[PDB]
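Internal QA ticket QA-208
Title: Verify multi-chain structure generation after dependency bump
Assignee: T.L.

Test input:
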Amino acid sequence: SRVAKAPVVVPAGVDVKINGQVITIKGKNGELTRTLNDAVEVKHADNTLTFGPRDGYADGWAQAGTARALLNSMVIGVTEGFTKKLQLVGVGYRAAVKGNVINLSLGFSHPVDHQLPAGITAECPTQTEIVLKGADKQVIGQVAADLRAYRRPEPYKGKGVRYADEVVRTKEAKKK
Amino acid sequence: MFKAF
Amino acid sequence: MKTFTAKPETVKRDWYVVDATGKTLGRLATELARRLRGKHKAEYTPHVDTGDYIIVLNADKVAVTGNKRTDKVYYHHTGHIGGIKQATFEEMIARRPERVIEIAVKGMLPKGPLGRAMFRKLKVYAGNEHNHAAQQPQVLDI
Amino acid sequence: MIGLVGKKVGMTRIFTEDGVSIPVTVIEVEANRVTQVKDLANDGYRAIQVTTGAKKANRVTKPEAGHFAKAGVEAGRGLWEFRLAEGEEFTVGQSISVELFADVKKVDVTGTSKGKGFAGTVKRWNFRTQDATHGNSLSHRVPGSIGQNQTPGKVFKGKKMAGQMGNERVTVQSLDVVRVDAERNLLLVKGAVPGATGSDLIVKPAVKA
Amino acid sequence: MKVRASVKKLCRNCKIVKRDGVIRVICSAEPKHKQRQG
RNA sequence: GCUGAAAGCAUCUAAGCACGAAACUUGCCCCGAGAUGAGUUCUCCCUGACCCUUUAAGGGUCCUGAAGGAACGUUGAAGAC
RNA sequence: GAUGUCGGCUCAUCACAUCCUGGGGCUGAAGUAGGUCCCAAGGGUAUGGCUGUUCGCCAUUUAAAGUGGUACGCGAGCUGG
RNA sequence: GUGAAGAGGGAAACAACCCAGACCGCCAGCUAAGGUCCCAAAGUCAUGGUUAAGUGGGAAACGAUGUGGGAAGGCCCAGAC
Ligand SMILES: [Mg+2]
Ligand SMILES: [Mg+2]
Ligand SMILES: [Mg+2]
Ligand SMILES: [Mg+2]
Ligand SMILES: [Mg+2]
Ligand SMILES: [Mg+2]
Ligand SMILES: [Mg+2]
Ligand SMILES: [Mg+2]
Ligand SMILES: [Mg+2]
Ligand SMILES: [Mg+2]
Ligand SMILES: [Zn+2]
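Actual output:
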């Protein structure tokens, strides 16, 4: 339970409220909230958030670490919005952003339109790359997966939607 | 009357 | 002398209201069946319905232990070949929540004309309110 | 969406400039008067009950006469109900004409099919007839086997057998509206519809869309 | 994915994980190595 | 698949989320309150005398016979009856 | 002191160890088309020549012409090769 | 040994298994096998543990950081994993 033991610091500019099990985080980048489970105990007796297992719960230690991990990113989100970068590889693969909607061309016979979550923002510096910014790590990762799901990188040529840092193991086609 | 030989 | 036997037209019957919120299905059902059959009365008679009227509220808020909130399957046959139907506990709650209580109690009550008569005294509601205020039921903490 | 109750006048052919012949069923849809409106607070569902046509007052029963008098409407052939959508609203005594379908391209027509009486399995279920020769003995169009010996030891429910055919409610879906003639209270729908000439007919906008 | 009773690691990169009561092997080095018990 | 600990990493899962098939529950069509748990809504009709004792959801005479139904007759693209 | 055969005909019904259609993982998967495995039983799942034949071979089709249980389903239903 | 030639209670139903040998009557009591939440007579009994699989309420070789307990060993605040 090393992760659980490590405390979470709340620097200036971040306001945190604890009301029973629901813990709220506020900051410049937005507002976040989640409902922690009963097996995890969280305290705000000092400038850092402390975590521990509630008595009587077998899974307290294992699940306590999860609460610390989410809130560590939750604080990071309100102070620095998580960023996800995707790259489009293809002969004529292009992407466009109309605001809360992303328009992509991926060789299909119909247009592709994706609706972003209310808490997510997207930018398209280049037609072959789309950059997503958001406050909560969960949704931004899910949104990136959804866009990647439209056309996963092909093993033989790597064309498709991929994360910026993704590594694609290209395989050579069967000879002859 | 049937038969079964 | 002759052992006492309850008489159907002399039995005294009273009404009760039970809140099913948070109660386990099986363990609540046994108490209802015990009360419905009249096993709690000192004048209990096997061949006479000496039970009481029970009103069940919040029938959709009953709990089930373990994973059987999704693995508990209710089977019934339509009478036509291939007419075997299944409905998990969650689906039953969504569609007709008061079936789960009635089915559980029905399987614990006696079988036959008397058993069916006992079941008629059970009145299950999905909501928190009932229209039997005229019967002024007494709160029963099962 | 609301529909209207009409009468099956018969079948007719409609020619077109291009040279196509369109078989159309002529349906007479007179003024449909609203006799009662169903409200959620009182009835638990939203619907309108309408009556069409007229019937001799001598044969109108007292309870039936009293109901029509409530809505200030003349007694019709019968009474039919139509469910109301979210935006639809009507008032007792209002008259609805065939113009409702002026903007409708497809309709749903329901009615009682022609009664064939007691029909055999060959006619009722398209059962294959057995050999008419080659030794066949009194089994030219009998149903044949109806079970599988001891294991089931019974006949399953729903087994296809001879019995009443027709004379039952039938609905035909997605019939094109060839023409709507309000000045004569007529509605021409492509194709045939259930029931014989003069039978009661119910027309609704195509639910299948 | 190959379904068989005997599920074992096949190279240094294979890892045995439990997801829904089923023992399955996930390999980041080669897709052929991914297995499920069934 | 996302996030994520147990297990400082990794991990689709243990807490919590997302997608996913002609299967499943609906959607479409027909029967359907004997659904004895026998339901709901709208109209229509009946507003008299008495008598007896085993004095009670009691029996009986006289007056009354409504809404409606049935029967009969002419019949149906309804039907073995 | 009797439970009537093989095959055909008629009419079927269930299982899923799936033939087609549907959804997936690998592929020595470029594409097209396949191989293998997993989920899936809702629907669908040839006509003829020879032979008493089931089967099988052959001809020509089909998205496919699935494998089995049901007294090797079904003669108080037919046939009797 | 039992059945045959043996009833009664138990094993849901179940001659041969378990308990136990019916002279008759009783609306008395204690027990065997087996049981005690409801159908259905008796513990929703008292303690200390295990299981999360409805395992218990069917099945092997074999496979797996499931989980509890026990005795050892390598490494480690000279900084391990
Ligand atoms: Mg003859
Ligand atoms: Mg003949
Ligand atoms: Mg026979
Ligand atoms: Mg039987
Ligand atoms: Mg005999
Ligand atoms: Mg379906
Ligand atoms: Mg052939
Ligand atoms: Mg046979
Ligand atoms: Mg011969
Ligand atoms: Mg003998
Ligand atoms: Zn590997």
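Spot checks passed. Residues 94 and 173 of chain A are 26 Å apart (CA to CA).
Status: verified.
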